[PDB]
């Protein structure tokens, strides 16, 4: 248990805990993280039968900022950036766990790249005829948004009347769960239900009803290009997608009562070179202008202490089965081949 | 896909450097290529091919 910490409350993590793995309970894993966790990290949780996250400085720095958030001031945009596989997604997840345990309302977009590529059913929106709806993507998110924020969905009550069809319409004063249920049940109305959820939460957080975290991973997708094409194969712009149009509005700092934490990702990005990782390189001019002013937070490769704790956590779980891996010579080869990159180390240790 | 400023600057540069000024499609641009080179029949390699 040299690599482990007994403090499992994300609100009590400090610099003494750097490098140590804290356990996320199975209940929190089902509730807080129905989505968002890296695909390969989810494999580890299944294989090890436990979810343990290393307390690192990027999350510690962002947790410190979120503990001192002035809820009166406009929401501050925090952008996690860093090279491929340094741990931007899992740093964001550690922060989502903190706010989730403090009864914040969580708006977790696990990967915004999925909304701008590989869409089978791109339907024209009824609310606005120049925009496109993404029924499958919207319904998928709504189901998970319901799971995370089931406690609050009854308390929050819509402040307008929303016309779904000629026959159906949500009335003022009903719980927001009804809007979420409509989108889930009727998938043709899912995109508009997402827009309404976003519209209501932004308005009602400023009124001081709840604290709202906007956690968007892969945020560079919002102001880039798309691989979605029209009937005539003309390229579609991200602004034309209604689902993206509504998320962009959440990114502006014209509301208060919460924070906006985002993470960049070149993985899954469109029309970006492999080694692009800096904010302006990935966001572009339009993306940088939308977020400016924002607080960049660097995520780097493991430091010597962090690297040793990761090897010890794998050794404690018996994941390293090669007889030379526990030795000092094996550890030096592990460090060189990964260069302490968390993602490269995990992938090489997966078959060793 | 050009701004008015960019379009008008390109038209000024084209006038300065002696290039086509009016908007011309690729088909009609062949007239420029035809009169900028010698016809193949007029080249010394062609008509003086044989001793």
């Amino acid at each position: 248990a040299i690599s482990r910490t007994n403090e499992n409350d994300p609100a009590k993590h400090g610099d003494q805990h750097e490098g140590q793995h804290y356990n996320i309970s199975p209940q929190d894993l089902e509730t807080v993280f129905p989505h968002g966790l890296p695909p390969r990290f989810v494999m580890q949780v299944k294989t090890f039968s436990e979810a343990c996250l290393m307390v690192r400085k990027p999350a510690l720095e962002l947790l410190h900022y979120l503990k001192n958030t002035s809820f009166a001031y406009p929401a501050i945009r925090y952008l996690l950036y860093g090279e491929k596989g340094t741990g931007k997604t899992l740093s964001l997840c550690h922060v989502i766990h903190f706010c989730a345990k403090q009864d914040w309302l969580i708006l977790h977009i696990p990967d915004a790249h999925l909304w701008v590529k590989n869409c089978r059913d791109l339907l024209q929106s009824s609310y606005n005829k120049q925009r496109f709806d993404q029924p499958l993507e919207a319904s998928t998110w709504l189901k998970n948004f319901k799971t995370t924020n089931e406690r609050f969905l009854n308390q929050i009550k819509v402040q307008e009347k929303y016309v779904w069809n000629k026959r159906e319409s949500t009335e003022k004063g009903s719980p927001l769960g009804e809007v979420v249920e409509q989108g889930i049940t009727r998938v043709r109305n899912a995109t508009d239900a997402v827009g309404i959820v976003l519209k209501e939460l932004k308005r009602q957080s400023s009124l001081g009803m709840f604290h709202l975290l906007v956690a968007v991973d892969g945020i560079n997708a919002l102001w880039g290009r798309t691989t979605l094409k029209r009937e005539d194969k003309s390229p579609i712009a991200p602004e034309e997608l209604a689902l993206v149009h509504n998320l962009r509005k959440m990114m502006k700092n014209d509301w208060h009562g919460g924070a906006i934490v985002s993470a960049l990702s070149q993985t899954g990005s469109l029309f970006k070179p492999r080694k692009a990782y800096l904010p302006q390189e990935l966001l572009g001019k339009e993306g940088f202008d939308a977020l400016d002013p924002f607080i960049p937070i660097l995520v780097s490769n493991y430091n010597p202490k962090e690297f040793e704790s990761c090897i010890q956590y794998y050794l404690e779980n018996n994941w390293l089965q090669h007889e030379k891996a526990p030795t000092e010579e094996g550890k030096k080869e592990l460090l060189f081949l990964s260069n302490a990159n968390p993602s490269l180390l995990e992938r090489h240790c997966a078959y060793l | 896909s050009l701004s008015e400023y960019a379009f008008r600057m390109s038209r000024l540069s084209a006038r300065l450097f002696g290039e086509v000024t009016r908007p011309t499609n690729s088909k009609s641009m062949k007239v420029v290529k035809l009169f900028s080179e010698l016809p193949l029949a007029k080249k010394k390699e062609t008509y003086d091919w044989y001793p």
Binding site: E83, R274, K275, K332, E333, L335, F336, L337, S338, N339, N341, L344, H348 | -
Partner: protein, 132 residues
């Protein structure tokens, strides 16, 4: 700044590398100004860069700034492996240099692409032969 370093060259197929090996370092390799794991995403290529330093038990003890041009991904890793091994010979014992030479770490690989001949399909591949 007074830091001791050695410089050597390495050639593999059409790739040509120039390596500067510093006597003391942390194990940082820069290839054309880029971190080696970013320059060589393929694992096999990074294993070739480890072989010279691992063979003499000096992983994490030197810094390397190398420049490589020409060839493909694997040839460039081979050219750098040779340039690094030759320059690293300045900071090891004579006996260790002989072990490096007997492990094939200091020989220029002469295997280069053979030319295609006329009347054949490839360098060796012949056209289909028809007895009748």
């Amino acid at each position: 700044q007074g830091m001791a370093f050695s410089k050597s060259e390495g050639k593999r197929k059409t790739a040509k590398a120039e390596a500067i090996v510093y006597k003391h370092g942390s194990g940082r390799i820069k290839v054309n100004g880029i971190d080696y794991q970013l320059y060589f995403p393929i694992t096999q290529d990074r294993e070739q860069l480890m072989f010279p330093f691992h063979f003499v038990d000096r992983l994490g003890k030197h810094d390397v700034t190398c420049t490589v041009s020409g060839g493909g991904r694997s040839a460039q890793a081979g050219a750098i492996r040779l340039a690094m091994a030759k320059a690293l010979c300045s900071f090891v014992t004579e006996d260790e240099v002989e072990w490096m030479r007997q492990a094939g770490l200091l020989t220029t690989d002469p295997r280069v692409r053979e030319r295609k001949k006329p009347g054949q399909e490839g360098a060796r591949r012949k056209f289909t032969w028809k007895k009748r």
